Design a protein around this ligand. Sequence first.
Ligand SMILES: O=C1OCCN1c1ccc(-c2nc3ccccc3c(=O)[nH]2)cc1
Ligand SMILES: [Zn+2]
Length: 208
Amino acid sequence: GTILIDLSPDDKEFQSVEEEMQSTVREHRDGGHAGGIFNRYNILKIQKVCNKKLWERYTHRRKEVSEENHNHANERMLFHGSPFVNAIIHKGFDERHAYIGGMFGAGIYFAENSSKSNQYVYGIGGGTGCPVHKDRSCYICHRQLLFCRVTLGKSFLQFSAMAHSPPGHHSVTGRPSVNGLALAEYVIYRGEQAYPEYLITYQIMRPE
Ligand SMILES: O=C1OCCN1c1ccc(-c2nc3ccccc3c(=O)[nH]2)cc1
Ligand SMILES: [Zn+2]
């Protein structure tokens, strides 16, 4: 049921999604171990992910959350990196896409920093890196991230350096409490609370 529509680089929508990718790169405390060493990306393609059934599943849950939270879905656009991006865009998010060992429990994790999601493209901790060269910092191989619409609802705030949401909450927010430059990360515990809106194909770029 999924079709992928290419955006033109001239399209304002391409440009605004690219800007969110590039502008939310940061340095990571692993010195690039998981995701590679880079300050920016080479964006190769941005595609809109269109699936009516998955969209309706998302908006149905969004309305339920909204109604439980004074008509406020608390919807964000957030990055998700996973070796399972291809399954996600066809079948939707579900329990198989959860990070069982995540610091906020077994849920599906999203980041404000694109560079954080980039650390997960080849698996937890970058796995063994790219399939072709076994390099977590590969500058040749094409990578993919999702830029997703995510319903947070009432989000449980965790200050810090598939399970259930905390009672009375629809998500968890992981607030950075140490690294002053890090943006927030978020966890949802139901696949229906995220829609994979854009598929971004890119390379990390070797700094000069
Ligand atoms: O453990 C896994 O088995 C199935 C799939 N998976 C997985 C784990 C973590 C991530 C991931 N974890 C994050 C943690 C924090 C912030 C972003 C992310 C992010 O974009 N992705 C994605 C998928
Ligand atoms: Zn490679």
